[PDB]
mmCIF file of C-alpha atoms in Angstrom:
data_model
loop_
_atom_site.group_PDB
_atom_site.id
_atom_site.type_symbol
_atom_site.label_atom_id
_atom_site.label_comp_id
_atom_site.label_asym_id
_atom_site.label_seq_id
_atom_site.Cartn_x
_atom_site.Cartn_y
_atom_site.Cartn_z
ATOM 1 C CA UNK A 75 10.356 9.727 3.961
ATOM 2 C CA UNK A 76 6.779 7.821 4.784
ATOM 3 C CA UNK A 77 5.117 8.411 8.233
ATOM 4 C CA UNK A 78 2.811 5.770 9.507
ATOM 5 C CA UNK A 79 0.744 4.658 11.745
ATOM 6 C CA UNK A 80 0.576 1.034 13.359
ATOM 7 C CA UNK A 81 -1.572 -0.663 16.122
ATOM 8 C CA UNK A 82 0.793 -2.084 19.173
ATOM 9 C CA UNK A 83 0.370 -3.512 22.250
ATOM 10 C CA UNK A 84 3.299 -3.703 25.379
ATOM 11 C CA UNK A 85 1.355 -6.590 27.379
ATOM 12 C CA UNK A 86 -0.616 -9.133 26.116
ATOM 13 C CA UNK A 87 -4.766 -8.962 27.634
ATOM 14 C CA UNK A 88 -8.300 -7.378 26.539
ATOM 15 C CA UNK A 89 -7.729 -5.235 23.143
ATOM 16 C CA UNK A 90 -9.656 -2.606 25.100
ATOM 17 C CA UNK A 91 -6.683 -2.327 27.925
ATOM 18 C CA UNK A 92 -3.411 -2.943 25.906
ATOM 19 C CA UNK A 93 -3.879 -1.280 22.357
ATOM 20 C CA UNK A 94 -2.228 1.574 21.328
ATOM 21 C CA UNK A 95 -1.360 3.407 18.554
ATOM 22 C CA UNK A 96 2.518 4.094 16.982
ATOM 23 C CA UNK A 97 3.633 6.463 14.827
ATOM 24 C CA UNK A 98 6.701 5.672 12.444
ATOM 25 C CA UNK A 99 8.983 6.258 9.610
ATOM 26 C CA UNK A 100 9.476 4.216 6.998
ATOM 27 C CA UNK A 101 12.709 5.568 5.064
ATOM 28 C CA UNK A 102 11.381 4.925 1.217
ATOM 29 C CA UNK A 103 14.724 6.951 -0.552
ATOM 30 C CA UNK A 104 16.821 3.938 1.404
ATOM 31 C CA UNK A 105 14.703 1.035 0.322
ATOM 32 C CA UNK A 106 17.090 -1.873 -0.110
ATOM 33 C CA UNK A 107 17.221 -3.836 -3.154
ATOM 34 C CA UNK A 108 14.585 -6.497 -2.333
ATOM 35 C CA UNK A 109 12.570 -4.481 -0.073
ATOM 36 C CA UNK A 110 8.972 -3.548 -0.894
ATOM 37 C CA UNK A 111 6.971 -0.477 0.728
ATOM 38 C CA UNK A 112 2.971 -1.346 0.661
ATOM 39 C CA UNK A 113 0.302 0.952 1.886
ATOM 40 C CA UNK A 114 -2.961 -0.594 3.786
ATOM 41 C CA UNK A 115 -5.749 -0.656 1.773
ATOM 42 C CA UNK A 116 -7.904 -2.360 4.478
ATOM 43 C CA UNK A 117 -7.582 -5.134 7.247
ATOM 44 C CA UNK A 118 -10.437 -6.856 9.254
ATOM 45 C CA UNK A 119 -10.733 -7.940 12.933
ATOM 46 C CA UNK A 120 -11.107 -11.542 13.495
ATOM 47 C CA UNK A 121 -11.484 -13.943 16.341
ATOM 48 C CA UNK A 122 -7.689 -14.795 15.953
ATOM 49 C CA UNK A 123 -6.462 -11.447 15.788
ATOM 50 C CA UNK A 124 -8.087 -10.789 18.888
ATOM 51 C CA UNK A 125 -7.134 -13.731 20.562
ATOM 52 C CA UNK A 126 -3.742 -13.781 19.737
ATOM 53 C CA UNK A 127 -3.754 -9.980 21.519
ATOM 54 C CA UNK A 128 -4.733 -11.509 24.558
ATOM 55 C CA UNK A 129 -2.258 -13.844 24.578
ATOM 56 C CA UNK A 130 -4.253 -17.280 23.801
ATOM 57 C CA UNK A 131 -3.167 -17.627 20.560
ATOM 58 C CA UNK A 132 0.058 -19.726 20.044
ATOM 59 C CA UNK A 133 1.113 -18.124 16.956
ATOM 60 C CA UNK A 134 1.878 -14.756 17.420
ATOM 61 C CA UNK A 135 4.452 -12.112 16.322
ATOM 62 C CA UNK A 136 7.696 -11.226 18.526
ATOM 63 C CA UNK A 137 7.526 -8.120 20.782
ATOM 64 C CA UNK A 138 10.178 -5.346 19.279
ATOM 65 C CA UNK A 139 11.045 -2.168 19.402
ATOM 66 C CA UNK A 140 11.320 -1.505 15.818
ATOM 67 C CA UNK A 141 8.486 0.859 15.774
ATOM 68 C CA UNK A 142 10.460 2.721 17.745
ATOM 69 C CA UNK A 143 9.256 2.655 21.049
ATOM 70 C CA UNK A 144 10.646 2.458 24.271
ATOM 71 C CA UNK A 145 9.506 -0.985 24.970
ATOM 72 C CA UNK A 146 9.088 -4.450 23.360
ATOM 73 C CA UNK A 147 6.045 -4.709 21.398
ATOM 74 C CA UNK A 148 4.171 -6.022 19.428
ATOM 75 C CA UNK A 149 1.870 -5.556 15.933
ATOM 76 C CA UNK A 150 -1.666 -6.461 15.644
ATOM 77 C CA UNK A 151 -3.965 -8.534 13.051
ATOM 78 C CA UNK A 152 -2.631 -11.191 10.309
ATOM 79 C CA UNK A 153 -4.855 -10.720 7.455
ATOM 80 C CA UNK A 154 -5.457 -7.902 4.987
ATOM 81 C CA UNK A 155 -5.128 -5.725 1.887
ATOM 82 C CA UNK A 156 -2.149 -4.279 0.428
ATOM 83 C CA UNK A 157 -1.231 -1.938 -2.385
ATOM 84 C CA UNK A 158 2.560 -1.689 -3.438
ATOM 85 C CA UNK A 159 3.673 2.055 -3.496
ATOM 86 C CA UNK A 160 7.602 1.265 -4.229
ATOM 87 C CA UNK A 161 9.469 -1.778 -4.719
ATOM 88 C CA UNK A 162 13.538 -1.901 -4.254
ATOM 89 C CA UNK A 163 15.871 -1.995 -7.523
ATOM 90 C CA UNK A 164 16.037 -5.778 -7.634
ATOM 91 C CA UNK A 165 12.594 -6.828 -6.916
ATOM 92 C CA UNK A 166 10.787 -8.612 -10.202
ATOM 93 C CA UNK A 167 7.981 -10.503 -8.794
ATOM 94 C CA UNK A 168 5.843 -7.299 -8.000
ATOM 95 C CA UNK A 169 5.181 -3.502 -9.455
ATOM 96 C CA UNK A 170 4.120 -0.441 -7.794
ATOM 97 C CA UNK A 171 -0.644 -0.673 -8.018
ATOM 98 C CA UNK A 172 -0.088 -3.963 -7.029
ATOM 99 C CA UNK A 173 -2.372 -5.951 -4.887
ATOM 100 C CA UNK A 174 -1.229 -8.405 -2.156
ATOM 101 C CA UNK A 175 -1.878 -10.140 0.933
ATOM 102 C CA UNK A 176 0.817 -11.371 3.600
ATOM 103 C CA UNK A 177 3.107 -14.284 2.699
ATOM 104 C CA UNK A 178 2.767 -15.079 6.416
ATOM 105 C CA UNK A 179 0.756 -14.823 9.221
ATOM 106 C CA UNK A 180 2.375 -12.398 11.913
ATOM 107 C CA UNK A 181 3.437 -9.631 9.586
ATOM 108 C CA UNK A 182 0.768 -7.427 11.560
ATOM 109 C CA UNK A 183 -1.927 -5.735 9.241
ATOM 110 C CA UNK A 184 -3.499 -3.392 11.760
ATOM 111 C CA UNK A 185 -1.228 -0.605 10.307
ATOM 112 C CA UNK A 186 -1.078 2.231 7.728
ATOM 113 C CA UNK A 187 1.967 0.993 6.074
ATOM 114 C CA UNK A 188 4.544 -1.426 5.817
ATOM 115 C CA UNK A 189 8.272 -2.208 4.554
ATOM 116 C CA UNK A 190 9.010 -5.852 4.039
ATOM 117 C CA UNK A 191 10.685 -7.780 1.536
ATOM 118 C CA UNK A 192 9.194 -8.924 -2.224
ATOM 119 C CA UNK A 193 8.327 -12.432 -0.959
ATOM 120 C CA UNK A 194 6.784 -11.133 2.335
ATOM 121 C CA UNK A 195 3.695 -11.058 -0.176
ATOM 122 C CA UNK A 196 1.434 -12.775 -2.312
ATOM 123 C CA UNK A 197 0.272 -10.908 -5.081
ATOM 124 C CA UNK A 198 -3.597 -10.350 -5.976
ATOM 125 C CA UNK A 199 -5.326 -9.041 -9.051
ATOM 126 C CA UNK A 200 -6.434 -5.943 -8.497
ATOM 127 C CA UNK A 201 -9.680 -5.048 -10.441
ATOM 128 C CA UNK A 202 -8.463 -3.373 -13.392
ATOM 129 C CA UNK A 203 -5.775 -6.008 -13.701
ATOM 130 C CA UNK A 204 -8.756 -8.840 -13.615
ATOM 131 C CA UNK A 205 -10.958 -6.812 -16.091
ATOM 132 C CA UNK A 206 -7.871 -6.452 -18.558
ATOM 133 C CA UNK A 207 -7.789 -10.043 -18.632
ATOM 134 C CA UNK A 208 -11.095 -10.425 -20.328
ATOM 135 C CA UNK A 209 -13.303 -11.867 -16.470
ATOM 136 C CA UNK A 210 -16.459 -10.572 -15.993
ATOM 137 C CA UNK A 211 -15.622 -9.324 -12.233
ATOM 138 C CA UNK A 212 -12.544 -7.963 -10.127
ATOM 139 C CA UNK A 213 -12.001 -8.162 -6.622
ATOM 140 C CA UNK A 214 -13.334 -5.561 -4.225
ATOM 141 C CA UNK A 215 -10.822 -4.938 -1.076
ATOM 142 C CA UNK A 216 -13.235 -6.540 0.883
ATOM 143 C CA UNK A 217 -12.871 -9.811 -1.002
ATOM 144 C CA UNK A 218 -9.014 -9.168 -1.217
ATOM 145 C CA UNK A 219 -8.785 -8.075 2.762
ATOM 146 C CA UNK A 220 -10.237 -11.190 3.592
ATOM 147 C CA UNK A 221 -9.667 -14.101 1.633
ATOM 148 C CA UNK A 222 -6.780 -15.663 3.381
ATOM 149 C CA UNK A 223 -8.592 -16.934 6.772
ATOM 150 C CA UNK A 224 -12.218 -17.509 5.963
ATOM 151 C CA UNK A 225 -12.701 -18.932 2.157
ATOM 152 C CA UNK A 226 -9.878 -21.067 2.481
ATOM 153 C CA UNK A 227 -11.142 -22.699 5.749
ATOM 154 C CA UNK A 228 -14.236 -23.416 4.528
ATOM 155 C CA UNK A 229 -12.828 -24.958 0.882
ATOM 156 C CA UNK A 230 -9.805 -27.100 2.617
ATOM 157 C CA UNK A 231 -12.597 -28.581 4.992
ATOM 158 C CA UNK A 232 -14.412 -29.877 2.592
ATOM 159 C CA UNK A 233 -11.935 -30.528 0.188
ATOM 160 C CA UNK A 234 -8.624 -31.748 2.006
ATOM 161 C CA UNK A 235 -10.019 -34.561 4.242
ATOM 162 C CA UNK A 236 -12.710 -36.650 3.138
ATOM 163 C CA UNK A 237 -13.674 -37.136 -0.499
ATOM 164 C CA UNK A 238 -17.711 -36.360 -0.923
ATOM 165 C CA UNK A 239 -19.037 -37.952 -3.661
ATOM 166 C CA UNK A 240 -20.875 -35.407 -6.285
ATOM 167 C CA UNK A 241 -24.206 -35.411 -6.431
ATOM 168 C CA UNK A 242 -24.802 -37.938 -3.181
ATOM 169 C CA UNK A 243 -22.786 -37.183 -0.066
ATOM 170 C CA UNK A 244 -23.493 -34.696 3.139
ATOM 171 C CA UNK A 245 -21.615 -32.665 5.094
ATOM 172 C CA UNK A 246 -23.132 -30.858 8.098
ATOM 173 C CA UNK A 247 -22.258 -27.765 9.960
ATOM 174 C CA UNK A 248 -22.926 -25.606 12.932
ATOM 175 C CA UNK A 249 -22.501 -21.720 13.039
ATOM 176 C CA UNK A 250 -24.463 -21.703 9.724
ATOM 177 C CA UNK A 251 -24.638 -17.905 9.241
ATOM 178 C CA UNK A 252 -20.915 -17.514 10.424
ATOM 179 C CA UNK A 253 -18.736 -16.170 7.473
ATOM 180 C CA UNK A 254 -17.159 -19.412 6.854
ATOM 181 C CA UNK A 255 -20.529 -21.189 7.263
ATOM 182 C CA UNK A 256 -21.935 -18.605 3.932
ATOM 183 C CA UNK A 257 -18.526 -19.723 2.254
ATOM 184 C CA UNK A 258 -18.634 -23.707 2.620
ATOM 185 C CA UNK A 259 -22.785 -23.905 1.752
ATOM 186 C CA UNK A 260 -21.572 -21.775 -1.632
ATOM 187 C CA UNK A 261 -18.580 -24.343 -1.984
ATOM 188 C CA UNK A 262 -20.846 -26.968 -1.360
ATOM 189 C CA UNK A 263 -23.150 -25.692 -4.011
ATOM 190 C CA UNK A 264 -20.100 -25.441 -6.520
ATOM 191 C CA UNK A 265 -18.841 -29.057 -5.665
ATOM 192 C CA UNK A 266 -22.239 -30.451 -5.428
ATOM 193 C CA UNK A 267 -22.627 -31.637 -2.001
ATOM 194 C CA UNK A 268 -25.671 -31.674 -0.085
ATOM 195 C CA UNK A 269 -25.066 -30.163 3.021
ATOM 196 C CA UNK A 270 -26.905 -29.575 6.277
ATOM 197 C CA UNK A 271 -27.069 -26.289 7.795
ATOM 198 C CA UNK A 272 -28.045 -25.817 11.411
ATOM 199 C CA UNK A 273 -28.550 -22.143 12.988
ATOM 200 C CA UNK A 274 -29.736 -20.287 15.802
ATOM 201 C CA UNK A 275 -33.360 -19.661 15.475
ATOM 202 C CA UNK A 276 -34.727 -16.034 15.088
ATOM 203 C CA UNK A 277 -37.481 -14.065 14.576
ATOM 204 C CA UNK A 278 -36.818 -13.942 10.648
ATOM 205 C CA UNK A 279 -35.826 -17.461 10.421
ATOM 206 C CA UNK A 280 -38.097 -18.113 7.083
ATOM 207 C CA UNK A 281 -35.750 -15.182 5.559
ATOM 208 C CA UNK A 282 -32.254 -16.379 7.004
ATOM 209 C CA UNK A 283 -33.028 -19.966 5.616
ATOM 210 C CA UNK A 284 -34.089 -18.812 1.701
ATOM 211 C CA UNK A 285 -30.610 -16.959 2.064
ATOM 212 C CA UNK A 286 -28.545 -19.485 2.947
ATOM 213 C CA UNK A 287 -30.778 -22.156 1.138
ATOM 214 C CA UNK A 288 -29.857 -19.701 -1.896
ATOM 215 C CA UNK A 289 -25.981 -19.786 -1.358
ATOM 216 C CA UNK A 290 -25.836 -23.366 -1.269
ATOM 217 C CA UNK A 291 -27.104 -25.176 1.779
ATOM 218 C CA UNK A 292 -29.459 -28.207 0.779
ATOM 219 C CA UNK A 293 -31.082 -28.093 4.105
ATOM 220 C CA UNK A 294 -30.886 -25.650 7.076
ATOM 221 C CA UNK A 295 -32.279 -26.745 10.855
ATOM 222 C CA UNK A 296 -32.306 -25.137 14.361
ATOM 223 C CA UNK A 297 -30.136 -25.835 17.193
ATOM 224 C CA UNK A 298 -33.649 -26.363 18.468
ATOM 225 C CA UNK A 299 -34.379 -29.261 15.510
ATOM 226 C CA UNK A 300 -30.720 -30.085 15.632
ATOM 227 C CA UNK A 301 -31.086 -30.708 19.745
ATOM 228 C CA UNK A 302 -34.012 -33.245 19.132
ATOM 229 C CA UNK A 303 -35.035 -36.878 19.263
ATOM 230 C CA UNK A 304 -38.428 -36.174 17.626
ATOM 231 C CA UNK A 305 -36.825 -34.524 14.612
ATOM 232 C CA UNK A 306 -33.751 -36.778 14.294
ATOM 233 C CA UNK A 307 -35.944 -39.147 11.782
ATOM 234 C CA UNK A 308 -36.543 -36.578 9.439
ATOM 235 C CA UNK A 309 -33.137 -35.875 8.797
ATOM 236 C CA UNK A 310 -31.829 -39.368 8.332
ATOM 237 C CA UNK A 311 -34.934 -39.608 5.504
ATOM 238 C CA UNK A 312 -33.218 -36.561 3.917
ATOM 239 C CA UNK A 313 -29.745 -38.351 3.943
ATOM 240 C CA UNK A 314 -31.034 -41.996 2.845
ATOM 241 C CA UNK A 315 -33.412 -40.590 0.087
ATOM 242 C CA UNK A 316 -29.887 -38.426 -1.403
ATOM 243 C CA UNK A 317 -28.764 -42.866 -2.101
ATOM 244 C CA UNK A 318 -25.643 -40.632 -0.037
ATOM 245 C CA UNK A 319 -23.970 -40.566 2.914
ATOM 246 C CA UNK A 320 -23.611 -37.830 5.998
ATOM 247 C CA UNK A 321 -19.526 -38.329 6.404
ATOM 248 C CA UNK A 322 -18.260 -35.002 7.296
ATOM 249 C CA UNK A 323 -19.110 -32.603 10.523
ATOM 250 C CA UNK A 324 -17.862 -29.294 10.914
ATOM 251 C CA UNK A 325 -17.684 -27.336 13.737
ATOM 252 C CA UNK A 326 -17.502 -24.068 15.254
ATOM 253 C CA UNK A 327 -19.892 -23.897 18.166
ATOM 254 C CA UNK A 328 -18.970 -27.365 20.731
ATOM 255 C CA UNK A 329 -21.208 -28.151 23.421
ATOM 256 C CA UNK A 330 -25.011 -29.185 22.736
ATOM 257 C CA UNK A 331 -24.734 -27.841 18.685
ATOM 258 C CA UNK A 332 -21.682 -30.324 18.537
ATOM 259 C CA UNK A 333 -22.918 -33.472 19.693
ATOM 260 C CA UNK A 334 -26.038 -32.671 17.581
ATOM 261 C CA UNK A 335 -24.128 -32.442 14.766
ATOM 262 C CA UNK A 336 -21.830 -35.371 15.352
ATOM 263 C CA UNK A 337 -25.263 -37.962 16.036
ATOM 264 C CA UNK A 338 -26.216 -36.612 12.456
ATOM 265 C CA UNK A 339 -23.220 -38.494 10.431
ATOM 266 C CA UNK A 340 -23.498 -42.101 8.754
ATOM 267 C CA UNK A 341 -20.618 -44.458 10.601
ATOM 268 C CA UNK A 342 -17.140 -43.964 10.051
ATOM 269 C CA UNK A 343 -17.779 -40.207 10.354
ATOM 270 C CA UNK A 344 -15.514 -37.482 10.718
ATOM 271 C CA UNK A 345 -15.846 -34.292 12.633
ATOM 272 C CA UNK A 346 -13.281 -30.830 12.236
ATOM 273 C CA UNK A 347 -13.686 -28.631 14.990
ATOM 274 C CA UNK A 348 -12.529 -25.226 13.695
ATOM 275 C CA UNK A 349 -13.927 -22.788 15.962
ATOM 276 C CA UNK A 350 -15.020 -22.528 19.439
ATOM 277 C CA UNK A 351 -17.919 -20.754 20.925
ATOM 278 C CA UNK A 352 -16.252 -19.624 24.440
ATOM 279 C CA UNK A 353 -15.792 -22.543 27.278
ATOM 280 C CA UNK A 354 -17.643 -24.975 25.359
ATOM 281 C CA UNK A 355 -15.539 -27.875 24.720
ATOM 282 C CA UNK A 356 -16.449 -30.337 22.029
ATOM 283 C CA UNK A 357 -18.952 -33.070 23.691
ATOM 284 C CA UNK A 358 -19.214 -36.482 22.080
ATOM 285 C CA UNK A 359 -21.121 -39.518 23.344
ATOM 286 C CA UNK A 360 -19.149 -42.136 24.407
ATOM 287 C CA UNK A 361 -21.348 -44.338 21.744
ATOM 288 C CA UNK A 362 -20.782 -42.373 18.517
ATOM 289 C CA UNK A 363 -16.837 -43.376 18.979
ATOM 290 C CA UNK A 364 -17.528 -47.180 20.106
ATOM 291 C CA UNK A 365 -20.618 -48.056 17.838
ATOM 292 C CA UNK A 366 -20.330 -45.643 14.643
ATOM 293 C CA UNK A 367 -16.610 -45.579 14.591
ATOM 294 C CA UNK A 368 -16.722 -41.655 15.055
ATOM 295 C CA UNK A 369 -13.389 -39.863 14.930
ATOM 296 C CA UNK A 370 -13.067 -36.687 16.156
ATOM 297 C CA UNK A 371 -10.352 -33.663 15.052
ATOM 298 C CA UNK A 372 -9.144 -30.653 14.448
ATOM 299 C CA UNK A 373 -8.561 -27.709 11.984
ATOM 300 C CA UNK A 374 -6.413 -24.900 12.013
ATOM 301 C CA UNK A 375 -5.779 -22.948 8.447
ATOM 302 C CA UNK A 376 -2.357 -21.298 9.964
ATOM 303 C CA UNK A 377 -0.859 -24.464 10.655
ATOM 304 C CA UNK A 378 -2.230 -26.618 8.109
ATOM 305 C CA UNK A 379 -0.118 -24.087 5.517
ATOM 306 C CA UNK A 380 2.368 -22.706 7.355
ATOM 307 C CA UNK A 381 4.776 -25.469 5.152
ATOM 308 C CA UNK A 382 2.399 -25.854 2.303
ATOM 309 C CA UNK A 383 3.119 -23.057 -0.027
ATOM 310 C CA UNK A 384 1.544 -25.186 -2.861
ATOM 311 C CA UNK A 385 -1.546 -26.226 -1.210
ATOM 312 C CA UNK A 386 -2.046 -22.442 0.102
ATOM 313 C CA UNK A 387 -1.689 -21.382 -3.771
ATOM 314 C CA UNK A 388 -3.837 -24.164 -5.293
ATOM 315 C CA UNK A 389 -6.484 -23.074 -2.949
ATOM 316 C CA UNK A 390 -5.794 -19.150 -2.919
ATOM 317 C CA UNK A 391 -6.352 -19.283 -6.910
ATOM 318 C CA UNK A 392 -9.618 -21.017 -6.888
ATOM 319 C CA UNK A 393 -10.874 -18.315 -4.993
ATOM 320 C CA UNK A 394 -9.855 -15.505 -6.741
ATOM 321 C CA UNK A 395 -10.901 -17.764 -10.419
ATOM 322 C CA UNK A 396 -14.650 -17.943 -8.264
ATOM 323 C CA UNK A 397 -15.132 -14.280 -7.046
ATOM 324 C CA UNK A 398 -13.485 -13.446 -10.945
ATOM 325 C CA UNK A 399 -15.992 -15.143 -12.711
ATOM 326 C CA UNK A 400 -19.049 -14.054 -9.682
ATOM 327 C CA UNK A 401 -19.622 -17.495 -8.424
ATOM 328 C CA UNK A 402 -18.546 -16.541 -5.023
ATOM 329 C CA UNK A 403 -19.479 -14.222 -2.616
ATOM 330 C CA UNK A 404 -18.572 -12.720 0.274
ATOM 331 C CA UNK A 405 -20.345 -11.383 3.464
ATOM 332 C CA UNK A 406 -21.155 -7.636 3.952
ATOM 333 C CA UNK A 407 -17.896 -5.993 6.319
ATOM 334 C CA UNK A 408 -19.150 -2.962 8.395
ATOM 335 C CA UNK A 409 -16.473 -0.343 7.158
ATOM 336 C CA UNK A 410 -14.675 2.132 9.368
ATOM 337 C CA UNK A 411 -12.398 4.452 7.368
ATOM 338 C CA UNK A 412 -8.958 5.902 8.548
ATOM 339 C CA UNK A 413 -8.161 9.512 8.403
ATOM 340 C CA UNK A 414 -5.683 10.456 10.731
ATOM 341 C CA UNK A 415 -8.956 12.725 13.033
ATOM 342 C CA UNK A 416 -8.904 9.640 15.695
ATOM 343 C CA UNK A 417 -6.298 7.527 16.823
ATOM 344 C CA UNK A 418 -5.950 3.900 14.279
ATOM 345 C CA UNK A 419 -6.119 1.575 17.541
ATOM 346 C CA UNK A 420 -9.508 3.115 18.785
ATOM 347 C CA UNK A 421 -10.867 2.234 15.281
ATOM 348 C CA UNK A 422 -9.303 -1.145 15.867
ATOM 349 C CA UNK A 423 -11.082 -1.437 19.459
ATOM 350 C CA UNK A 424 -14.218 -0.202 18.029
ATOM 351 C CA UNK A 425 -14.389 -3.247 15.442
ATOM 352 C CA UNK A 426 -12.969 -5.886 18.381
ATOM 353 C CA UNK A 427 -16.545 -4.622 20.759
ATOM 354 C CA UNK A 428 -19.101 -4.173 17.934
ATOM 355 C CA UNK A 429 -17.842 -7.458 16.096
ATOM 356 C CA UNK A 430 -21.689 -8.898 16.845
ATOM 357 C CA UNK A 431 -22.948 -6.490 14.201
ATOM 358 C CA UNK A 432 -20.913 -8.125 11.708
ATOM 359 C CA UNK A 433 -17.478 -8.704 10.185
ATOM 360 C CA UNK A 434 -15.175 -5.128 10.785
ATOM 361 C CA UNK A 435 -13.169 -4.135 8.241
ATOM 362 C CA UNK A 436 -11.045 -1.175 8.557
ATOM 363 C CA UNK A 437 -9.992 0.966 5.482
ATOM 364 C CA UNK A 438 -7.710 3.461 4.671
#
């Protein structure tokens, strides 16, 4: 017998309010012939986890009582790190050291442990498994806990909509030092487009910009810059000098930032709104969709491959190839480690309220 631990919630609102934590057994001497036990390695806290707690998030997991409460409810987080501690008598597709990631959204990763079946996963390389196969870098569980949301956002933007040519076309985003910001300017730099970065000023702003300027982005502006009239001439220079185009827009921020961004694009641009900076819708002159032929959509990486097991593979693999081989890079996570002294939701509540310092992973 296995005794964990898993983050629930009865009624959906504020992860400060609803979260709790659940202790369970998982039976591993009556593991059924396709079944797979995994134990957490770690699991971050992101936007959508949290949302989908509150109750805004469309997707989200049915409300049970397999965890043996009293009550319907529900598990918490759809991204993380798994290691498999015991796989059923039939299962071929995975070994016990193994490292894996959910199949699915849903399958709730703010949790000790879980029992699923073999194809409820997607295995990883673990480090030692990478190294044995001659690359000069393996995973870290960082990189592992978070590559399903994040690096694939930022590489099917770029990639899945609009061909940039090499060497000549633009792309421009807001939320430049966001975590999927950091992953499309290294894309970028590995596909070789130029790309526009635009950011919050800040005191260090000469240190922020050699950063990202150093992970990939050609340019990087302030909201300030990318807010005015003055300063929009110097940026169409940049773009007509490149003998490119500006054709893409992403965005994660709406309001001013967006209709900055969306002013900045050759005709017959397109704009993916990905993100959402809190009650501030996406704002688009009325001109940019008359006179430039602007179009205007969305992006959602849970929908886009909830049916597109290939497409989620393709993409999965050319991360792994690029952290392998140490072209790619992830964002420092602010680790909290589980060990059974305080209760796994307060950790979990913790990361939701100090998310402003930076992404929260949560290890075990």
């Amino acid at each position: 017998m296995i005794t964990a631990q898993a983050v629930l919630y009865t009624q959906h609102g504020e992860p400060k309010d609803v979260l709790f934590t659940q202790s369970f057994e998982i039976d591993d001497d009556n593991l059924a012939p396709n079944e797979v036990i995994v134990k957490t390695l770690g699991s971050p806290v992101n936007p959508s986890d949290i949302n989908q707690i509150q109750g805004v998030n469309p997707s989200k997991p049915a409300k049970t009582t397999g965890f043996g409460t009293t009550e319907p409810a529900a598990p918490c987080g759809n991204e993380g790190l798994f290691e498999v501690i015991k796989v059923g008598s039939n299962v071929s597709s995975l070994e016990a050291g193994d490292w894996v990631i959910p199949s699915h959204v849903n399958f709730g990763t703010w949790r000790t442990h879980a029992l699923g079946n073999d194809d409820d996963f997607i295995k990883l390389p673990n480090p030692a498994q990478s190294k044995a196969n001659g690359k000069p870098n393996g995973l870290t569980i960082n990189q592992g806990a978070t590559i399903s949301v994040n690096p694939l956002t930022a590489y099917l933007m770029l990639t899945h909509y609009v061909k940039l040519t090499p060497g000549k076309d633009w792309f421009i985003q807001n939320g430049g030092t966001s975590a999927v910001g950091k992953y499309a300017s290294q894309i970028g730099k590995l596909l070789n487009f130029n790309s526009i970065s635009v950011i919050r000023d800040r005191p260090n702003l000469d240190e922020v910009v050699a950063s990202l300027k150093e992970l990939g982005a050609t340019q990087v502006i302030t909201e300030d810059q990318n807010n005015s009239r003055e300063f929009g001439p110097t940026i169409k220079e940049w773009i007509k000098q490149s003998g490119g185009e500006a054709k893409l827009a992403l965005n994660c921020v709406g309001g001013k930032s967006s209709t900055g961004i969306a002013r900045k694009l050759n005709n017959n641009g397109l704009m993916l709104t990905y993100g959402g900076m809190s009650f501030q819708p996406v704002t688009i002159p009325t001109s940019l969709y008359i006179f430039k032929n602007f179009t205007s959509a969305g992006f959602w990486v849970t929908e886009l491959l909830k049916n597109n097991k290939e497409l989620k593979t393709s993409t999965l693999n050319q991360i792994i190839a690029w952290y392998e081989e140490g072209k790619l890079t992830d964002a420092k996570s602010i680790e909290t480690l589980y060990d059974g002294t305080k209760p796994l939701h307060e950790l979990y509540q913790d990361g939701v309220a100090n998310s402003k310092d930076g992404k929260q992973l949560i290890t075990y």
